[PDB]
Ligand binder design. Structure first.
Ligand code: NAD
Ligand code: NAD
Ligand code: NAD
Ligand code: NAD
Ligand code: Y43
Ligand code: Y43
Ligand code: ZN
Ligand code: ZN
Lengths: 180, 277, 277, 180, 277, 277
């Protein structure tokens, strides 16, 4: 039986984390839907998301939340990236001026065993693409190009995307701190 | 600090082959029958009273919101029992009950006494499906009445829908049961003197249950047994979602917690009842 | 459906000049003294146990989280009483108590019995500040001991910090008080037979208080009084933030709700105690 | 004694609503701080804000939340306007292209008596100013010009701003429905 | 016949750098904190009992007057502990404790064991002020409980105010400690086998301390060591006001007297603790 | 709260005719023989050491000043015993002993065991004056030695002057008797199990006596007798000048105080011993 449960309703996050942490027999999977608070700080939102998911499932839970801080928007959306990609689909490449396309793709895991919450944050420098290119991946992957690379997250495979994305450095930290 | 399924399985075989294990079933045992639990009743009581279900749940506990419902109008509690009968003991709830793996695995064992705190005929009705016969005992006239010599007696600890005077749902009905004078209260306290219980689908939220195990531990402490002998007879509490505080409160009362797999709640209980056989 | 301050003021003058009004004070009566209520104790118990205060509050009620604290280590409950004595009855809490308008208005009236459920000497200490003298009665030895013929007897219904055996804070201590055999329990039930009570700063969340007014209603319904005479003797429940369900539960038990102004909670209570004079 | 309590922590909203509904003796004032959920829909946020404020103060409460839907951002921020003005102060006039400056200033009251929540929404067409002009008012008033008018909300007095702003039509609806 | 401060300073450096020096602190170590000693408690016990403080001090020793206080009324000893906790461990006594030069000079040294006979948290509390951490050991559950690998253990030889069962104040409590069976008694007698002690602020008036050093001399005389080797391991007794009889009684028991300057009692002790460093 | 002479006289007749009353005599029983008490010895020890008698008495208790005397010079304790034999058992002290009314009234009764804590042959010497014969038992060789079939055994609890090794006068000798291993200690604790004692001329100032009656109360409290039966067997404490604290300490230990007339101390004791006959 598992002892830690990764809660997500996003089925594309689920097959990413099962690609690397899938072989661990100590990790189960739940799909409870939680409501995030309104704040641009990633640390604040992921920390209030874990207590809201422990209240739902009542087992040691691991939640995940992201950020897409942009320099042209002074860090917006931040942790408000979920209703930007809903509203601005690929016009998000056009609302940002050409010449200052730089941004940060941040990502945070927070595990709550019921008495303490611990947050693990990784971060990837990059820049917004001039137009959405690429087919693979999911939300905002056709618009983000990491630093040094020329291709987007959508143009790379799942093994290549996780060698750049924040989740590829968060697998090793989550496995070490939880013994998965 | 918490038993697993494979660890608690030989401990349940020993108490069952001695005939000293008694199931205590809760409202969660009827959840694969698509029946409301204690939260969806309050969502239905708020719709009748004109409340929003999220605003009505913040005005008191489950015992207190049902007391507010019963005194809003005359004959308002009688209607609830009628509506509950139509939805709990319906024909489509019986059809989901033969194909339920928990109700098949419960009736496969040769029990002698089953305690339930649910308002439906789906625990004794599972025994009728397996060819066995049961005896519902809820009121004083049921205990006095005739029964076969060897029949699993199903003790409706909360009441039955065909006898609406026995239903404890409102707060005044729980305070009437604090005196421990009801025939389900007197039968439970004498069976707790000599038997292990298996809590399935029940969460210790009612203060009428937690007060009985309190005063059984009092008789235990005043009898001045040793450390070894006062910890010999245990009770078992199978729960998918037990927290961090509640399993340690129940270690005082000789209640062990069996952690079940929370991914599929229906199959985890069914593997526990098949491991007793 | 709820009395205001001006409506309930002549009803409180009549019971006071007959000597049949008794205050029942809660934890909220010591909030202008900057003392923790039942929520900031749990925030302090979670810091000692290593919990986060928001995660620890989701594992049970106030009675159950204190039971978990007391059994985490030996002598853990004794330390809490010692710490509580340093913070509740400190010198800076006494200095805020002479200049408090509620404690001046409470001691200006000539009471004979005051019931409190707080662990501090700030109710009888308000009586010593006004030149009067009080008599703390918490244990069996206090009731048996000597007292002046005419002195306001302050009944510590929950216990006192100078007698740590009388403190009811954990769940096992509340279950011990369910039998209604303690000397504060026996004194309360006899004063409820003949007197009106005034609930100030207390919210009916403890099931040991709600069970006493339940049984009083039993004696009342079995005595077969009329509609007019069974509703004659009322009790009064002053609360800034009473909801929608709880005032209608207490109409069963002859408890009227006095709605106070929630903008300034300290001055609304002080105008109630000055309206009795 | 009051029977309805207007809850806000923003002291500039408080002196606006006391300018018009101040003479009503049935309206009290509280200052409990609530946390909004993450959604761009104004109806969803104001409805979850009233239950979160009734849980705090336990009296019949009236809460208020706004929106600044912009056509160039496909309705963004919407009810997410509180962390935009924190991040983009007057660069918000510069992130939007010149020529399609149109926007809507929406505003919503929600009163909760403890058993039902009722939402009143008004709405003002306008357009984003080319640069922040004006001294009066508060957050995002120097950037919004109503339709027909040439001046901002910041350039107008409190009586003139409430003849254009959504709160000036919500006083009469709140007074009528509550009997203030 | 009596060591001075400069003579005893190299003798204390040698035992400290070997890790074989242990402080024994008395009631006089908390006198700059404006706390009562053994004489002002009796002046406070006489006020409660109705005695004059000069007449009450002539009816027996300190042990016997506290025994008379504890049996005058029920729950009279538990009232004293509560009152003592309000005055000894108050906030203004903590504020005088960071600016006290003795408590700074005590915590500057890297001790491993400290014995105290005072009921206040101002010896381990001085260690928390210097960034160090301490471990209060007063009862059997404290010795059995968990501590860190290396933490100065503060042995409350008389008891602590947060555990009122460990306080030895009355005569029956001192007679219970004559058997040398308590966990502070067993820990002291094993540390006396191998370590030098430094008595600061304590006067040998209790017959439970003088009896332990008596029996240590027995083990010493029956072991038949020479004149040179039986006088090698000494103990040190810093006192401003030692008389003429008591320093010669303690030469039997390998206890040397350090005469401190009686003009400023606070600065004389602080120069002793800084001379060890 | 204190027995008089006429009240305690029938209580002493009942224990004497059953043979269960044993006198415990102190230093004050030899005061009409013009012998020094514990205060005039210290006045004589200060003259030898060069002290003033008022300054020497402020440097410790009676046990501690005699310990200081014995270690001032070699063979200093053996000189004192020789001096005390010349003054306590002199010929003019024997001549005052036949005409003493207390020593006549003591020897007129047919005792079987007498305990004394004085250093003189004036208790057994009073028995030889009345024609009776006594048996002094002070050391181990006296208990092992031969006596007659029936002879009042005088137990020298403190020692005798003709056996100077048995004298307990210095502090190290009292600490040697704390283990309760001496033959006078073992004989006293077995006679206290079954007999009432009559304290005449002794004041409870020695902690070796008060510790024996403490442990007797232990055996009494652990045996769990009732309120009536644990208070049945009393001891009696005749004293002219008992204070206010000390009679209430001894009520714990089943010791009753007999108030004698302090005007003539010799005749008040003699009327007590004649009232037993
Ligand atoms: N006719 C009924 O079945 C019915 C329905 C609602 C309420 N009630 C009455 O009101 C009381 C409150 O009901 P309640 O549900 O809130 O408390 P409860 O303690 O009776 O049930 C909660 C327990 O059900 C368990 N549970 C939930 N889903 C489960 C599943 N799929 N399989 C196995 N166990 C599961 C939970 O883990 C939890 O331990 C009930 O005790 C009952 O007396 C009865
Ligand atoms: N030494 C203490 O004072 C103390 C502190 C915490 C807990 N406790 C004990 O634990 C129990 C739980 O405490 P609780 O506070 O959660 O329950 P409670 O019912 O005793 O107090 C809540 C009540 O206080 C009232 N209140 C709050 N602020 C007030 C104010 N400024 N003026 C007047 N009334 C005010 C609330 O309206 C509410 O009705 C307590 O009943 C008590 O036995 C005691
Ligand atoms: N919480 C407390 O501190 C406290 C207070 C009163 C009593 N008690 C208990 O009751 C017992 C009564 O014993 P006692 O107090 O009569 O004698 P004591 O032996 O405990 O203390 C007396 C010693 O304190 C020393 N002293 C006095 N002033 C000093 C100063 N300014 N600096 C350093 N040393 C100083 C004296 O020289 C003397 O040697 C105590 O031993 C204690 O167990 C504790
Ligand atoms: N050879 C001796 O007689 C002798 C002399 C001095 C000391 N000592 C030893 O030293 C110890 C201390 O002597 P202590 O006298 O101070 O203590 P103590 O308790 O033995 O004698 C005091 C008691 O003598 C009583 N007393 C005084 N005058 C009396 C009288 N005229 N008649 C009857 N009773 C009278 C007092 O009331 C008091 O209760 C003694 O117990 C003893 O062991 C022995
Ligand atoms: O690496 C990524 N590559 C492309 N898109 C990504 C990525 N990581 C998150 N995303 C998208 C998904 C979602 O649209 C939003 C996160 O918002 P988020 O609230 O966490 O998603 P969700 O509500 O659908 O699932 P969940 O229940 O786990 O919170 O950004
Ligand atoms: O008419 C307006 N003219 C100019 N600025 C305005 C206006 N109306 C709202 N605003 C600002 C204030 C706040 O920065 C944000 C609303 O966000 P909002 O969460 O409601 O503000 P808040 O948290 O400070 O106070 P409250 O406790 O009432 O929610 O937009
Ligand atoms: Zn989400
Ligand atoms: Zn806000």
């Amino acid at each position: 039986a598992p002892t830690w449960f990764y809660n997500t309703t996003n089925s594309e996050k689920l097959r990413e984390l099962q690609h690397v942490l899938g072989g661990s027999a100590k990790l189960g999977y739940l799909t409870a839907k939680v409501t995030e608070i309104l704040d641009v700080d990633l640390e604040t939102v992921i920390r209030a998301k874990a207590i809201a998911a422990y209240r739902a499932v009542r087992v040691p839970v691991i939640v995940e939340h992201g950020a897409l801080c942009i320099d042209a928007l002074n860090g917006l959306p931040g942790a408000l990236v979920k209703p930007f990609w809903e509203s601005l689909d690929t016009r998000l490449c056009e609302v940002i001026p050409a010449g200052q396309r730089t941004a940060r793709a941040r990502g945070a895991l927070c595990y709550c065993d019921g008495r303490e919450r611990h947050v693990l944050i990784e971060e990837t420098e990059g820049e917004i693409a001039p137009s959405a290119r690429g087919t693979g991946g999911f939300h905002w992957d056709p618009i983000f190009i990491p630093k040094g690379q020329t291709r987007t997250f959508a143009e790379m495979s799942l093994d290549e995307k996780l060698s750049f994305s924040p989740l590829g450095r968060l697998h090793t930290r989550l496995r070490t701190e939880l013994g998965l | 600090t918490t038993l697993t399924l494979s660890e608690a399985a030989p401990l349940l075989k020993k108490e069952f082959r001695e005939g000293r294990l008694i199931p205590f079933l809760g409202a969660g045992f009827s959840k694969p029958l698509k029946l409301p639990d204690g939260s969806q009743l309050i969502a239905s009581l708020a719709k009748t009273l004109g409340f929003e279900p999220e605003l009505f749940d913040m005005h008191g506990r489950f015992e207190q919101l049902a007391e507010f419902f019963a005194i809003s109008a005359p004959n308002r509690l009688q209607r609830l029992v009628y509506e509950m009968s139509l939805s709990f003991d319906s024909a489509e709830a019986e059809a989901l009950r033969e194909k339920s793996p928990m109700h098949r695995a419960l009736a496969a064992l040769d029990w002698r006494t089953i305690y339930t705190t649910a308002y439906d005929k789906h625990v004794e009705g599972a025994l009728r499906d397996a060819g066995k016969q049961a005896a519902v005992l809820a009121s004083f006239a049921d205990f006095q009445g005739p029964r076969a010599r060897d029949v699993c007696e199903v003790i409706k600890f909360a009441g039955t829908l065909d006898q609406p005077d026995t239903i404890v749902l409102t707060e005044s009905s729980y305070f009437q049961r604090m005196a421990l004078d009801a025939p389900p209260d007197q039968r439970l306290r004498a069976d707790l003197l000599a038997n292990s219980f298996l809590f399935i689908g029940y969460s210790f939220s009612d203060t009428n249950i937690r007060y009985i195990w309190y005063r059984m531990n009092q008789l235990r402490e005043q009898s001045q047994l040793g450390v070894k002998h006062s910890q010999a007879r245990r009770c078992f509490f199978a729960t998918h979602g037990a927290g961090l505080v509640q399993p340690d409160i129940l270690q005082q009362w000789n209640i062990d917690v069996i952690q079940l797999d929370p991914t599929d709640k229906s199959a985890s209980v069914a593997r526990l009842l098949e491991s007793i056989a």
